[PDB]
Amino acid sequence: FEVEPILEVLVGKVLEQGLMEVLEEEELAAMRAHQEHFEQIRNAELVATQRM
Amino acid sequence: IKQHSQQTVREQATQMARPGVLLDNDYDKEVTPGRYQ
Incomplete structure (x- = not known):
């Protein structure tokens, strides 16, 4: 009964705290991935246009 | 020479389910009301 409240x-x-941190980290990492x-697509098409 | 009983007074705190930091243990009981007078 002395440890009930702290627990x-x-x-x-x-x-x-864990759930909030997980949601925020997932969103940031996913935005970085997008x-x-x-x-990468931009750079590939830049190379193609330069060739042409 | 008679006998009388004594007892001090005792206090309690109640805290409701909080959307934040709180998780309360459930050690409660249920009841059905019935009629009243």
Whole structure:
């Protein structure tokens, strides 16, 4: 009964912080991946146009 | 010479389910009301 409150508050805090951090990291990494995918197509077509 | 009983007063805190930091253990009980007078 002396450890009940610390336990409950810590458990919930850790779970919430973890879920929020995971969602934010996934979104940022996924945006970086989209930017990289556009950057490569752009460069390939630039090379083709320069050749022509 | 008679006998009388004494007891101090005792206090409680209630905290509701919080959308934030809180996770509460459930150690409660349920009941059905029935009629009232």
